[PDB]
DNA sequence: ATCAGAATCCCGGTGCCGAGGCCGCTCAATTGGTCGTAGACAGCTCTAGCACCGCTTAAACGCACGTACGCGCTGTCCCCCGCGTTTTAACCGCCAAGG
DNA sequence: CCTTGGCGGTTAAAACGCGGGGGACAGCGCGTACGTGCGTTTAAGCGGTGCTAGAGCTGTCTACGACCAATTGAGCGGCCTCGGCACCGGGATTCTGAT
């Protein structure tokens, strides 16, 4: 008997249901922390951060990216595709007035 | 190079929450660019507030104010 | 000592709201009824959101309202969603929603 | 270093609408954020209203108009009812 | 009165928007959109008008409504 | 003018309009529609079309948060 | 006697700006340098826009700047365009721009 | 009714001595000046409030300019402001 | 249709830690009184808004028509997907080097 | 015997690759919607003619709000207690795919 194998898409759908059901942050804490401190270091040196400040930044960033991915998804589907591409992100952000 | 700390599976998870079923290979780098820009815009303003207050510590409120003036109002960190 | 909130029949603090109006640099003078009205409106809105969020909390067999419940409450309500269209609820997540075309065929 | 917040009032309201329901600290933080946000919206709009009409006083009428501008539909009507009733009772 | 916003007017608007080819179903759609937009602005505008205890909608009322929708308009102050 | 006064009658009655008010409304409305048509066009082109359809307008308006 | 604008080397009215700050419900007090600074900034921005718009007016063989020239000036400048990204200029029209794919050939 | 018309016209004569301006265009420039005034003053007001200061000074104006203006416009505007304050002070 | 297998939902349990409850200060909300100026109410007006109409014609409406773009059907390679395989960062963990 | 510095051992999350299956793309064919044009029409625009509603303005009266002492208890800070459920252990449901 060949071992079990879900068809491409099934596990994807499962993941969609899973992560739309939950609210936990999806980016790893420490690397996000590093990214924020790096970028901030490029504006002002020897900055410190309240932990809540970084937490605020991460909540905001993830909500932003998630919404962006919703719009991107709509752009891909509009073009009769199921796969989001850079053209879909760029269209979404252009219509948003981000670019 | 900490932008690379935003891994492929993390971006995949974010897209999943955004309802995305299938993802082109070029998306991840693209996303990294976008996020980078986003952060640069918020953090900039945040630091500006921090610098105006003559502080060396970025507070949650500085971030909240930056987000607000960028039309990205955030609830839950005023405490 | 009867308070303005007690006289107005409110739970929200009329005196505090008045002080915040006075020191918020909104106008040179502030009428007596303005903080009463404002406190009443704020209280009402708080009530509507807590109502819906509590309902959502009971739907999850939960006795404590969490940010997720607030998100469910706001986003499943058309007018609250309009009012808070540009607001991010930390730890709120999103509404379950899969595009039909993405489902198996 | 005392900090003020709307927590106890939010909690009283909560006990009004759901007697057997509690609320997490984070959710309370979100409610406080909410109340401050809407205050700053309404007060700001009322300030502009008073200025546009060459008035030095923000009254319940400015507050009401601001509520009508900022809130959508039924939410606005209901809020207006609550406000007006509160002011009429308070004056009496 | 929505039909008073004719097809060629909508075509002109689309042309200014750079549109080369237009579906027949567009016009009615556009009208709906236009209607909504107007309903949103005028509402707020009139609100201002009534706060001023007036019966005449001024250019400034409109400007304030547009401004509060984040649709800032220059040239009518 | 007719459309504006008609819609306005449904909010508040016996209203009067400055001509400049109506003009302001028209400049705003037409600017809005033109921009919308730009975005709509971008959606149609995105779908490999040259022809804008109601579908395009609806996508544009959804992404705008309208 | 000499003016707060003469001394600051400005064309824009320092006194007026100061007065507008005082009565604008912005703060309880207003510093002496604030209206000078603000007036300077406003004058600078005005100068930049009139510079470019004047260029457009000369390009259209006109001696008078019209709203169209202002629109052209603002939209063809990246930073001015961002600054005024949510602004409608009456009778400004739009930048000539046709998507390449629409070209017949 | 007041407006910035005469000052806008003076500036125009500085940058283009032989160039005029239509009435509509002048009304758009008035709109512009009032708009930017409100943005900067508003942001400076919030800056003052956040820091529990009762006075708006040139420092709030400057920070507000840095928040509101993009890139080169911010740098140049800041330069002009500081320069004007320095000259006025002298 | 039909069955085996993996993911999913559901039944004890469990203890723990954070929210609910409570006890002790105190300053900001409440009370009383006194100035006063911006707010409330009545009238003049004449300006701009509004109702009605003669004359004009180009924009608007109805119809011919044919094709080129929108849509249905098909071949295809390649482009992401599922799972095994490593692949890599991080927290110990112990034995060896030195005094 | 005490102090400190390496290379493994184990957890946990993440690229490579190999088969692999289906989906965007391009092509071919078919259908009919609408641009371009032609014939017919009327209501928006110009230009008057007349009528009038009410906001700007002025004036007059005033009373609720700003400001300043006195007052005090719920608001706020610091602890104390206990039950809902995240996770764990284990069985019944249910898609899911190949047959």
Numbering used by the authors:
A (entry chain e): 36 to 134
B (entry chain f): 24 to 102
C (entry chain c), G (entry chain g): 14 to 118
D (entry chain d): 32 to 123
E (entry chain b): 25 to 101
F (entry chain a): 68 to 133
H (entry chain h): 34 to 123
The authors write:
RNA polymerase II (RNAPII) transcribes DNA wrapped in the nucleosome by stepwise pausing, especially at nucleosomal superhelical locations −5 and −1 [SHL(-5) and SHL(-1), respectively]. During nucleosome transcription, RNA polymerase II (RNAPII) gradually peels the DNA from the histone surface without histone dissociation, until it reaches the center of the nucleosomal DNA (the dyad DNA). Conversely, in the histone chaperone-independent pathway, the histone transfer from in front to behind RNAPII is proposed to occur via the formation of a template DNA loop, in which the upstream DNA exiting RNAPII rebinds to the histones within the partially unwrapped nucleosome downstream of the RNAPII. In the present study, we performed cryo-electron microscopy analyses of RNAPII–nucleosome complexes paused at a major nucleosomal pausing site, SHL(-1).
We determined two novel structures in which the transcribed upstream DNA behind RNAPII binds to the DNA-peeled surface of the nucleosome. We named these structures RNAPII-nucleosomeL40 and RNAPII-nucleosomeL60, which contain DNA loops with 41 and 62 base pairs of upstream DNA, respectively. In both structures, the upstream DNA is sharply kinked at the DNA exit site of RNAPII, and is folded back toward the downstream nucleosome. The upstream DNA spacers between RNAPII and the nucleosome are 10 base pairs and 23 base pairs in the RNAPII-nucleosomeL40 and RNAPII-nucleosomeL60 structures, respectively. In contrast, the nucleosomal histones in the RNAPII-nucleosomeL60 do not directly contact RNAPII. Therefore, the nucleosome of the RNAPII–nucleosomeL60 complex may be more flexible than that of the RNAPII–nucleosomeL40 complex. The upstream DNA spacer of the RNAPII–nucleosomeL60 complex is 13 base pairs longer than that of the RNAPII–nucleosomeL40 complex. Consequently, the nucleosome orientation relative to RNAPII differs by about 50° between the RNAPII-nucleosomeL40 and RNAPII-nucleosomeL60 structures. The DNA-binding surface of the proximal H2A, H2B, and H3, which formerly contacted the DNA, becomes accessible and captures the upstream DNA. The length of the upstream DNA that directly contacts the nucleosomal histones is approximately 30 base pairs in both structures.
